[PDB]
Write a protein that binds this ligand. Structure first.
Ligand SMILES: [Zn+2]
Ligand SMILES: [Zn+2]
Lengths: 138, 160, 119, 120, 98, 214, 56, 56
DNA sequence: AGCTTACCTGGTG
RNA sequence: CCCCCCCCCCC
DNA sequence: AGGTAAGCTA
């Protein structure tokens, strides 16, 4: 109950079966394009890979799933800090606009509050884990 | 079937095998990429005899492949049951890859007999950055290359 | 496969050839890190996968009432106390093999008579 | 002209095959002089097959090597070769018929089973 | 069906409070390789945190509802194989007595 | 031997079908010419290596006495086979002039893989003569021989005139055969020409239909 | 059904109605036959409209 | 008839053992799939057949 | 080339 | 929005 | 929703 923010988050797996560079992008409300997950994480403050990878794949032994994520790291590699990540979600005007979308419209259940980037990060990570689990036929 | 081979079950089998589509993907277990620097030898000791049979004699214009090939190895493991199932030779399979990529891909293979079924491929450089090129060539290999049959003809069943 | 990260910025490590000494290294593309490769294997495909069959074998596997029970003696402890499931590999082709978990030693074993399996 | 250079290297590995394969005859119910001569009786025997009337050959050399080399299942068949079994028919043999009797066990079980499932 | 009812909707915060007071580590401080077996706890599709001995937790909650302390309409599942614990305070769920 | 054997078979199979089509078209060809065996074909059109020499295969065909009666203006035909898998514009001109000088009525070019867009442009270039192009592969099997393919008969202008009179028909009102239709191509149907189709009937035994070319 | 054990490919689990209409159906037999029957009514409604248009 | 009912029940019973047997055969990987069929697609065809032969 | 997009979708009361 | 009709039939 | 056949944007 409360305004009823009917915003549905889509986490897409691009590339088909036996197609080179299978990238993962997510569609955020009030942003035209589907942003590569790696940027969304860096926008949330989780900057290194293997920290972003740590949030998606829990078992650091599952080589199958980890190789399924190597293309995502490449797609996101162009951005390296939170600013550069918030800006890709667009000057000064776009960076501020981004913070707002991720706060109140991205994963509005959980919280619309503020400092719950880790709680929303592990959640996005849970979605990507769930996505790859079906893709690997598990 | 032809009017004279109406009951010849072997004629049916023979057409059935000659018409049914068979890709390199159909017989592959797993594909692999290794850093095998000197092409004249191997880091993988399993393939010690594979180089000792083919990279061996001949010797069909040695160096032949300039031997100034590629340090990046592409290795395919083929299924023994699936190979015999669709009736295929390692030589057959090898010749299809060898004929697909012509002289820009140096191919070798483990023999039918051998405990493991392996196809060793190296890129042929004319006169840096290759890791991507191999993932491109293996995608071609699996999804494209036809080994036996007519395209679109997917499953072939015999009937009396 | 089983890959590493850059100690210094935890970022992914990409391959690089040391042509002079004919050896493989892994470099950081966010800093000046480099390290000798462990194995010569770089990429592994796997078209026919067999990993994801014995998935979710938690020690509490016995506490699931939905799971059936058999009176097959254990090949390691010899207990007629089992909880059995079928291949967790959710692929169309998948064989109807049975995986049995002992409720007196917590060790898995199959009904498979085609292969001498130890996984 | 260039064929001679290629044909020489072919006989070379046949004598190699006949030096370290000739040992299980003497180890279990049947020196290098016997090998070189016996190895020549394949090089020109396989040459009768290639360039017919007027490519195949090289692959047939490897099949002959790998299989007759094998042991200890294929040495029981390789024993028949040195002790009166066609050296003329064994050259144009080339297939799954060369393979281990152990391998042929499974090859026979497999083939007869495909036929049952696609005969519909 | 005659005996079926539909959830009216309850309050989640008392369960959320009970959970953290019963071994529920917060998501804010999760380290996957430090807690690899860890069961994920969800109160209305909101991932709250992880729990190290889900067996005993599940028992406590079940005994709480059966006694009356957790509203009877509240749904709680333990997917042992998937390492997950989903709970629903949620309005609209169709239920039947057993 | 390997896969040279298969190419020789196919080329001979397509040669037969060309001869079959030429005969069916009206031209003088014997069944002996048609039923020519493979071993004889090899021994006539193959070099020292026993490899196909297509340039030799090309032939001239003259209309039969029967054909001369229906279509008096039906002239002689020329059929050419090329040893170049891709038939070049330099080769096409050589052919076009042959048909113009020897004043051939029709010219058929049997190609392996392709004919240059350059070459295939100098095709309607020499009227009243008409040029045709067939891919060797399409000719391997005679489609007219099929179970489902009934006999099509090319009608004389006089025969067409009569059909139209006897059914009080405007050309629009006749059922239609497409110009690019396999049987239309086989018979070298020109637009406006009519084909009498005689097929078996489960109701009457024999039923004759007609189709006009588009 | 939640009355069955996991990985049950048996005639009973997968919906075999061993009983005659005279003897009567078990709750399970009743419910599977209920799903089977439901399918029929759907492709009736579907075919009725599809077939109608085909005629037109 | 009472005797007819016995003959019916045993006919269903034997098809049920027949089915259990092919289930044991498939669980021990001793089952070989038909052309263009999953090992499972094959098993189901066999099972359905046994039961439909039975009801007839 | 592969997006999009309008066209229709049983009968009576 | 219902109503309507919902044939036949495993061998 | 779905198959088609125009229609046109990167
Ligand atoms: Zn670094
Ligand atoms: Zn045990």
């Amino acid at each position: 109950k409360g305004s009823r923010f009917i915003s549905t988050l889509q986490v897409k797996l691009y590339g088909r079966e036996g197609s080179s560079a299978r990238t993962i992008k997510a569609t955020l409300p009030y942003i035209k394009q589907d942003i590569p997950i790696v940027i969304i994480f860096r926008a949330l403050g989780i900057i290194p890979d293997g920290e972003i990878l740590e949030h998606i794949c829990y078992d650091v032994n599952d080589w199958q799933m980890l190789e399924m994520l190597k293309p995502c790291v490449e797609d996101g590699f162009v951005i390296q800090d939170r600013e550069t990540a918030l800006d890709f979600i667009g000057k000064e005007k776009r960076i501020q606009y981004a913070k707002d979308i991720l706060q109140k419209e991205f994963l509005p259940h959980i919280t619309q509050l503020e400092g719950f980037e880790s709680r929303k990060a592990f959640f996005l990570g849970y979605m990507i884990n769930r996505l790859l689990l079906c893709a690997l036929d598990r | 079937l032809e009017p004279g081979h109406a009951a010849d079950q072997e004629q049916a089998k023979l057409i059935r095998s000659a018409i049914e589509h068979t890709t390199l993907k159909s017989v592959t277990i797993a594909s692999e990429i290794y850093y095998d620097p000197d092409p004249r030898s191997t880091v993988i000791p399993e393939d010690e005899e594979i180089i000792q049979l083919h990279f061996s004699l001949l010797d069909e214009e040695a160096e032949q492949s300039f031997d100034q090939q590629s340090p990046w190895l592409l290795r395919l493991e083929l299924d023994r049951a699936a190979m015999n199932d669709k009736d295929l030779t390692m030589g057959q399979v090898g010749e299809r890859i060898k004929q697909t990529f012509k002289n820009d891909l140096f191919v070798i293979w483990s023999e039918d007999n051998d405990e493991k079924l392996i196809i060793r491929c190296r890129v042929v450089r004319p006169k840096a950055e290759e890791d991507h090129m191999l993932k491109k060539i293996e995608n071609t290999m699996l999804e494209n290359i036809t080994l036996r049959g007519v395209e679109n003809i997917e499953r072939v069943v015999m009937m009396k | 496969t089983t890959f590493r990260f850059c100690r210094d910025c935890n970022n992914m490590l990409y391959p690089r050839e040391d042509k002079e000494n004919n050896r493989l290294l892994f470099e950081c593309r966010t800093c000046s890190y480099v390290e000798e490769a462990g194995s010569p294997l770089v990429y592994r495909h796997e078209l026919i996968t067999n990993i994801g069959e014995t998935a979710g074998v938690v020690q509490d596997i016995g506490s699931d009432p939905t799971l059936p029970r058999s009176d097959r003696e254990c090949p390691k402890c010899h207990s007629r106390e089992n909880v059995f499931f079928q291949s967790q590999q959710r692929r169309k082709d998948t064989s109807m093999v049975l995986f049995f978990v002992c409720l007196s030693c917590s060790h898995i074993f199959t009904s498979d008579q085609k292969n001498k399996r130890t996984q | 002209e260039k064929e001679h250079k290629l044909r020489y290297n072919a006989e070379k590995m046949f004598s190699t095959l006949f030096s370290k394969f000739i040992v299980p005859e003497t180890i279990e119910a049947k020196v290098i002089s016997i090998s070189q001569e016996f190895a020549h009786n394949l090089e020109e025997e396989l040459y009768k097959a290639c360039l017919n009337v007027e490519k195949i050959y090289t692959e047939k050399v490897r099949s002959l090597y790998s299989n007759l080399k094998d042991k200890k299942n294929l040495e029981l068949k390789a024993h028949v070769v040195e002790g009166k079994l066609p050296l003329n028919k064994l050259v144009n043999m080339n297939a799954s018929e060369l393979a281990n009797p152990d391998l042929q066990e499974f090859k026979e079980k497999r083939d007869k089973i495909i036929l049952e499932n696609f005969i519909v | 069906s005659l005996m079926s009812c539909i959830s009216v909707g309850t309050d989640p915060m008392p369960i959320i409070t009970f959970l953290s007071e019963w071994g529920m580590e917060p998501l804010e401080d999760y380290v996957p390789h430090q807690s690899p077996d860890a069961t994920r706890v969800f109160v209305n599709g909101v991932w709250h945190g992880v729990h190290r001995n889900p067996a005993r937790l599940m028992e406590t909650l079940r005994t709480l509802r059966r006694k009356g302390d957790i509203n009877p309409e509240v749904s709680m599942i333990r997917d042992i194989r998937e390492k997950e614990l989903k709970i629903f305070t949620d309005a609209g769920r169709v239920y039947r007595p057993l | 031997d390997q896969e040279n054997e298969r190419n020789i078979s196919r080329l001979w199979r397509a040669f037969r079908t060309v001869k079959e089509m030429v005969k069916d078209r009206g031209y003088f060809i014997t069944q002996e010419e048609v039923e020519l065996p493979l071993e004889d074909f090899k021994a006539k059109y193959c070099d020292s290596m026993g490899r196909p020499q297509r340039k030799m295969m090309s032939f001239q065909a003259n209309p039969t006495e029967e054909s001369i009666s229906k279509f008096p203006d039906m002239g002689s035909l020329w059929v050419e086979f090329c040893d170049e898998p891709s038939v070049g514009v330099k080769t096409m001109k050589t052919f076009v002039i042959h048909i113009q000088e020897k004043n051939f009525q029709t010219g058929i070019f049997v190609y392996q893989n392709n004919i240059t867009p350059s070459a295939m442009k100098l095709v309607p270039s020499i009227p009243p003569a008409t040029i045709e192009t067939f891919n060797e592969a399409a000719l391997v099997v005679n489609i007219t021989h099929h179970e489902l393919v009934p006999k099509h008969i090319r009608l004389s202008s006089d025969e067409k005139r009569e059909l139209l009179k006897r059914y009080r028909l405007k050309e629009s009102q006749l059922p239609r055969i497409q110009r690019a239709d396999p049987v239309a191509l086989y018979l070298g149907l020109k637009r406006g020409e009519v084909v009498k189709i005689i097929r078996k009937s489960e109701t009457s035994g024999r039923y004759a239909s007609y189709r006009i070319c588009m | 059904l939640p009355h069955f054990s996991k990985d049950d490919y048996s005639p009973e689990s997968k919906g075999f109605v061993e009983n005659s209409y005279l003897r009567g159906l078990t709750p399970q037999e009743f419910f599977f036959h209920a799903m089977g029957g439901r399918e029929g009514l759907i492709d009736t409604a579907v075919k009725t409209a599809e077939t109608g248009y085909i005629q037109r | 008839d009472g005797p007819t009912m016995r003959e019916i029940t045993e006919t269903i019973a034997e098809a049920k053992k027949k089915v259990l047997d092919v289930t044991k055969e498939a669980q021990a990987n001793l089952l070989t799939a038909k052309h263009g069929m999953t090992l499972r697609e094959s098993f189901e065809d066999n099972v359905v057949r046994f039961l439909n032969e039975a009801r007839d």
